[model samples]
Target: KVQYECLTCMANQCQRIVEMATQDMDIRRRAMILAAKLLAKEYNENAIPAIAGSLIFLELYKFLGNDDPFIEYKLKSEEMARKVADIIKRKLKLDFELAVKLAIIGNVIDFSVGFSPEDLEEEVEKMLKDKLYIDDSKELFEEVKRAENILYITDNVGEHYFDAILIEKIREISNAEVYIAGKEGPIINDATVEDLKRAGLEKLGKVISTGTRIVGVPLKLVSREFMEAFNKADVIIAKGQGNFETLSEINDSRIFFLLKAKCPAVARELKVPKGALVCMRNKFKL
Candidate 1:
């Protein structure tokens, strides 16, 4: 069983697409326009402008449902940025420069292919049996532990224990201080601040909360506090799909993206399958 919550979210994303298509008629139409332009730019890349247009539409999606009719699916998922930003800014106190940095970093994000599995629906089962009882990660967990400060972003609940494994590696490899952050608000993820806490994140280093809807992906519109953390941290490790989907186009030289590619669009970009795990470090050393 995939669990009711996952089923609910999948249904919501699907249902809202229809409503979004009707309500965001302008944005959807605009996507074609921008995508056409992008297609003209390079015969190879249509994802960027298309995703940019969709992101713009996603921002406007909050108003489609208008907070009525009892089904706040689109509004809720779409409005995560706004709600999360407000929570972190007012409640947690992130800095302005940091917010811009996170946003700017988000713009530099680009999709790359990762691990491929024969069957995606059977991921939970396939991941369990491994030779080394381990997987390959890009950077040494020691790198994070050795740093003065580190920012850790998450992806899904199925891989949390793996995250802790990384954390342990960080502690063992380097003496770097660590801070793990989870989404400020909830929309489409399994891991939450609660999950991190339950998973015993508090015992490691500092466990913080982001001021945005997408925890792994930084949204400037979300809040000052969220950016504040990014600004203050020496290293950043972002996890999962939405993070890569939203932030892969970002330009931060120091942001490290750790994710398992699981989409066709992303696969085409990375020239790999959907289940490949990628641990890419983006530090621009002068």
Candidate 2:
């Protein structure tokens, strides 16, 4: 659900999107005004922030005449991810904990929070030294070890590379069938089937689409195939804040959210400081 703090962040993202879509100042202003109105009209305290975000971005895409404004950034992020992967392979052993940390660090490749590809290597190197704010990786590893089917939901582009590392680690320890899921279409910088293939994730596991362009896996919007996999999986590893936002409230113990607390709203929800690395299990209803 959205908190009061989410509005400003959404507004900032709206501005960034508009700026990326057009160079004309007047058009940018008008687009932003529309965004503001859409935000105001659609804002619901009880609804997940990503739902609002999906709507806002949809409108922006229609107004900007560019459906895939973040394509360039996504491509650059993929390149940076490969570089980061090379560095990780050289610098670190394939331990479960380090692999998990690398996967969470990859969440920083997000563009909505002003992260750029140029900053990826330095940012990842620095984050490697930090500790997880909510460390549930050990328990998550246990779940993965015993699970028969594992659903791994991915986030952004470059981030998928690190996710592949973690998935590889999971494979090394367990015989669980890992299924990688990405978005069905381009929504912001979120990875799609094309992006996942570009990252060569198909070789790591069975790659499937979440079947929606929404920021996260909203249960109602996903395809039957995704729903079947979601229900059948014994363990689910969901990456990034968007997945956390939409899936955190569900009463499911199998879901583990791996991400960086990139915003105040999510940070507050997780009771961690902003920018903290997180590996958390979904909260079960009492």
Candidate 3:
């Protein structure tokens, strides 16, 4: 995670990595080597903005509690990435600003619930009204109703309950097939297997774990089997910044990312404010 610039996720996945790595001394050594390689690979000109933007996350990581030592180090590692960026710049003469502003893209994504089912419905209705301009939400339901399978990529833990309601509706209205992805490792506020199961997601859909890190933007961090599931989905819905950040680079026409922009880094990239609701599809079909 440190090598990949996914500090939050590193913090979360650290214990898991340690657990896996410590199973054998060779694993531990290999893990360390992999970490170093990622640190080296992540140093580039396009990474600067994200490097600078990491300050906010470092501050956020301080409050994650004492559950795991790996998370603490991962968070520390993220902060260290910023410092590493300077070295990449000075010594390697590499431009560290990512050409694609994932932070800005992460902002303005939204998939929420207003506590009451009615309020949630109304909010979704209004958003779709603005974006899709269908006076009748039944049309949107119709779209969903026709779908055969659904893949949902989750975000914050607090937001999971709302997603439950949404999944229920998707089932009730369209009887759409459903699946949820949990953070494979920790990243930040994103949901874990524990959180999703606690939220009762298993009852509503088939839930799977695949995320490799929390601030889960870096590619190929999750797993091949997890990604294989992603490939099989007819309609993929991902909610939250990390999902958006990670998926934005993947061209998947069937994929739809939904989230509320929650930071300046995201807002600046998407050219939206810090709290805009976004829903867009990434089509990867040839």
Candidate 4:
């Protein structure tokens, strides 16, 4: 949980996304006002993830501006995904471990966290050889082998390509019927049904929606369809810090979170330093 004063910080984070999404001073100005108002009303640390402010600000940006600046970038990001997949496949071992690290690495594309990769290959190589800050991936891989049903919740749009690689590995290693959850509508750079389809996630399993346009899959906001899948899943793989912030407090035993601690708030919450990669089970240390 964050201090009550932290709502102001979260609102400023939302303003950053609004600024990235558009150059119109008027729209950005309106969004900042709305961000403050919305957060002031809804920013209880126990009630919602801090990232919710950014999502709400994005909603206002889309509604007021009627444009998404990231569409072109997102397309290129998908292409970046293919290139990254090829690089890792051609140069390194193509195993579950590689896929997991790459997927977390792909979280660099996130807009709110704003951590840029100075040199991607160097970053990837360093993460690959070094011991993971929180290495629960082997446990997660073993769980996948035994899980009869799996729910894969995605975070960003372009990063689905990275997720595609891992999803392929999940299918290869497990007999589980996987279900992918995307956003019902666009928010930030988060993936929609079409975005995941563009990444060809269906070959792995069924794709569904979390039923709301918030940053993370809040159990209360998801559709009945997603709720059914979530409740019935034998194993759950939640990607990125958004889901980590939202789901970390839940009491599910089967959920595993794979993410990069891209933001200071999330790094602090995870009890790890910023830029750390973690594969952790719910309520337990990896």
Candidate 5:
């Protein structure tokens, strides 16, 4: 559910998208107005932020005549992340814990927070020194060791590079058949099949789409394949705030959410300070 603060945050993101969608002042004005109207009509306390975010982007895409407004930005993010991954590989010997940390740190590449690719290196350096506000990595590793199937839900484009490292580490220690899932199409800067392949994730494991372009796994909208994978997996590793927002309420102990609390709403929901890194196992159940 969205908080009062989320409305303001979404409005700010709408402006950013409007600006990114076009350079024409006229279109930008019209788009912002339309975005505001959509926000007013669609948003409620009951609405999930990710679902609302998807609706906003869908309308903006139609209005701007560009299905993917962040295509170039996504490509640039992937390149920058690749470079950072190379640097990290040369500088550090990645163990399971470090791989997990790096994967969460990679969440900083998110454009929804106005993060720029140029700042990624510095952000990574800073986050490496910060501890997870909710550390559940040891438990997650235990699940990984015993699980026969692991479903890893991904977020963003460039972040997949770091996710690949984590996935590789997961495979090294476990015989679990890892399945990576990304968005079916472009929504914000979320990764698609093409973006996942660009990050070379296909070589790591079987890569599949969530079969919905929504920011998170809206269980009602997700594909049958995703549901099947979700049901069959013994362990699930969901990355980013988007996945955390959508899937946190599920009464499934197998799901482990790894992300940075990038927004006030999510930070509050997790009972952590804003900008805290989190590795939380879902404790919810019927």
Candidate 6:
């Protein structure tokens, strides 16, 4: 998953983006062809998840009548996640592990891509009550405490709520200066600068945009500001599979990937079963 593909995933998403953004046959046909070509060429060689996503999304954005194709679904998903946060607050004990798990549960909302909002609460509760297949909760806390400045790379729409709560806890308990990353522009339902602000994540800490309109944070492609933040941070708290796919390829000891192993590709790579909840300390740290 870090750097390769069979084209199945790219094509599936290409078709979906066309379906969501517009019904005009010309635009739809052109966008799908562009996506297939991009995926076959650049995406296959590099497997940059963001490139695979941005090609299709950017093309769709140009042709589609909808300015924000995902805004409707994004709003509803955000509402659902906020409700889950409310639930967590009622029963909140402020455990780092629990907060991390809730944030990972928020990851379950796929922003109309794969998840159903109807079962979000149930799914979140199930994840919370269940045991993580791979738990590094203690080590994660220790890493946060030991670090002076933590760079938290965020993922998705509704998931920011989970991230916000987790950030609050990290500040409250560890007193670490936290900086969270969002996408520079709209590509799929990944959070952007505005989205994070709307989620109230800024109140917890500083939020910076990766400034690359790609799916995952492609470190090389992001702007100078983000690069400085990445290099300066004491600990890198990576929040999703996309980040895992990109950063896992590098041998960075600081990055701790917190995500659910939702897909078979990543699960196989991580040596865990699919659907396993993971608080995996990557690189040489563990």
TM-score of each: 0.53, 0.93, 0.55, 0.86, 0.94, 0.88
Candidate 2 residue lDDT tens string, 163-276: 988998999999899899999888988999888987788888899999988898898789999999999999999999999888876799899999999888788888889888
Candidate 2 lDDT at 234 equals: 98
**Model 5: runs farther than 4 Å from truth?**
110-123, 284-286
Output the worst ten-in-a-row residue range by lDDT, candidate 3: 94-103
**Clashes, model 1:** 26
lDDT (Cα, 0-100) at 201 in candidate 1: 76
Give one digit per residue, the lDDT tens place, for model 3 in 93-193. Answer: 21111101111222222322124434433443344334321112333345566777777777655456545555665776666778788776554446666
Q: Which of the two, 1 or 2, has more lDDT?
A: 2
Lowest summed lDDT across 10 adjacent residues in model 5 is found at: 109-118
Task: Using TM-score as the measure, name the better of candidate 3 and candidate 6.
Answer: 6
> lDDT of all the models against the reference?
0.48, 0.85, 0.50, 0.76, 0.86, 0.78
- Estimate the TM-score for candidate 2: 0.93
Better of 2 and 4 by TM-score: 2
Measured by lDDT, the strongest candidate is 5
In the range 1-286, model 5's lDDT, one tens digit per residue, is: 6788877888888887888889999999999989889999878877888998788888899999999988888877777788777777766677887788889988775533434444655677677877888999999889999999999999988788889889988998999998999999999888897789767787888899899889989999999999999999999999998898899877888999999998888898899999999899999423
> How displaced is residue 57 in candidate 6, in Å?
2.9
Error of 3 at 217 (Å): 5.7
CA lDDT for candidate 4? 0.76
Candidate 1 structure lDDT: 0.48
Best by TM-score: 5
For residue 257, model 4's alpha carbon misses the true position, in angstroms, by 0.7
Worst 10 residues of 4 by lDDT: 110-119
Candidate 2 ranges with C-alpha deviation above 4 Å: 109-123, 284-286
Backbone clashes per model, in order? 26, 0, 40, 0, 0, 1
